[PDB]
Amino acid sequence: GAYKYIQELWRKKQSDVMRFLLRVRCWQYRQLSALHRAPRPTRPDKARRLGYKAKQGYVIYRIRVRRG
């Protein structure tokens, strides 16, 4: 299964690949608003192990919190 490979990918956050992904995604999220529905989870494996299913009735909201 690909979910395991995605799991080690996301555990290698300091790698240049994941660092590039995180930088680009953070820029885009910052450009968006503070509270908006995502069309689908960004981390499907993490969502699945947190209890998300690809069914009608599960929604995902991407939200931004001020730091400090």
Partner RNA sequence: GUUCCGAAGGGACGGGCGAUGGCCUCCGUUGCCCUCAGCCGAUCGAAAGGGAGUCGGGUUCAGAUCCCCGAAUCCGGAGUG
Partner RNA sequence: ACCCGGUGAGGCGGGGGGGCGAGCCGGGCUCUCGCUUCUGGCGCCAAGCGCCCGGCCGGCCGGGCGCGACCCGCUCCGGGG
The residue among 46 and 62 lying less far from RNA, judged by its C-beta, is 62
Per partner kind, with CB cut-offs from 5 to 8 A, the member of another protein, RNA, none near residue 35 is none
Instruction: Give residues in contact with another protein (CB under 8 A).
Output: 1-3, 5-6, 9-10, 16-18, 20-21, 23-24, 27-28, 31-32, 42-44
Which pair of tokens denotes residue 7?
A: 């799991």
Under 8 Å between Cβ of 63 and 29: no
List CB contacts of 48: < 8 A, sequence separation 6 or more: 3
* Choices 1-9, 13-21, 27-35, 55-63 (CB under 7 A): range interacting with RNA: 27-35
Q: Tell me, what amino acid is at 47? A: A
